[PDB]
Design a protein around this ligand. Structure first.
Ligand code: NA
Ligand code: NA
Ligand code: NA
Length: 298
């Protein structure tokens, strides 16, 4: 018998540990690092050359059944064909909305199998990391495997490295960005699990006012591309997800003129961390390295 109380407070109870797990791609990726296999995934999974998306982590993308290959896409008939026993995903709000389960078919999807939500709303990264760990352990993963304990040890060291970098270089201003054709979005730290944790470790972020973020209920500010120099920044961390324009591909002239861009002080941000200690370690090391070696340029 298997039971798990999720971050909505809902307890799923099944007569045996589910063999037919379907998960958001990034959740499947986290589970994979603890030795838990999933049967189906939905989300950014492969890129247009067939390579694994960043959100697929170390998943064997050929082996799994891909039900949707972008956010908000999940073929209901194909899902049903997997004899799904549980659906696992993240949640980004108070309501417990199941992330990436299509709004139009979410009721049909719910009929086929119970769901488990792990919240990545308004808390530091360490919380959903612990809750993903608990979920994996409830599914029979060996949490005392060398690979798992090594990953947790490395994460802790990386967190210490970032704390030291932020304390050693207090002048370095970090801007969290995401590019689209219409708009350049600047995230504040509040509400995001990665940025809340990085802030708690002492990183100096550019913070749009609450007033500037109110159109998204506090998540981010939308800027016209001509106003992307509004906030002076030394390091820019850019959204890496498939829905967004990657920094190497941005052609807008204002972007190209930013001091941090000219100095080569742009790195990746993963606004949807894969919730394993393994996949969150480079988030910490990458940011620490950017801060360690950044010049003040903004
Ligand atoms: Na296959
Ligand atoms: Na166990
Ligand atoms: Na340095």
């Amino acid at each position: 018998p298997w039971s798990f109380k999720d971050d909505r407070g809902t307890t799923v109870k099944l007569d045996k540990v589910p063999a037919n797990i379907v998960a958001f791609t990034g959740v499947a990726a986290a589970l994979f690092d603890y030795g838990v296999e999933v049967k189906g995934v939905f989300g950014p999974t492969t890129t247009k050359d067939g390579k694994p998306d960043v959100q697929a982590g170390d998943l064997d993308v050929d082996k799994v059944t891909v039900l949707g290959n972008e956010w908000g896409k999940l073929n209901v008939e194909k899902y049903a064909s997997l004899a799904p026993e549980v659906l696992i995903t993240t949640t980004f709000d108070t309501a417990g909305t199941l992330w990436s389960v299509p709004e139009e078919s979410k009721d049909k999807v719910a009929k086929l199998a119970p769901s488990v939500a792990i919240s990545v709303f308004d808390r530091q990264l360490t919380q959903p990391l612990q809750r993903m760990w608990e979920l994996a352990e409830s599914l029979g993963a060996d949490m005392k495997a060398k690979k798992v304990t090594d990953a947790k040890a490395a994460f802790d060291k990386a967190a210490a490295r970032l704390r030291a970098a932020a304390k050693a270089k207090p002048e370095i201003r970090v801007l969290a960005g995401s590019a689209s054709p219409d708009l350049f979005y600047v995230s504040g730290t509040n509400l995001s699990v990665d940025l809340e944790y990085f802030k708690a470790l002492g990183v100096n972020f550019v913070e749009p006012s609450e007033d500037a973020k109110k159109a998204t209920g506090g998540w981010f500010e939308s800027l016209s591309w001509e106003n992307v120099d509004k906030y002076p920044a030394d390091v820019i961390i850019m959204d890496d997800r498939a829905s967004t324009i990657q920094p190497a591909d941005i052609t807008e002239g204002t972007w190209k003129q930013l001091p941090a861009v000219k100095a080569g002080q742009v790195i990746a941000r993963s606004p949807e961390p894969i919730l394993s200690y393994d996949k969150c370690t480079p988030l910490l090391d990458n940011l620490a390295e950017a801060i360690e070696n950044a010049k003040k340029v903004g």
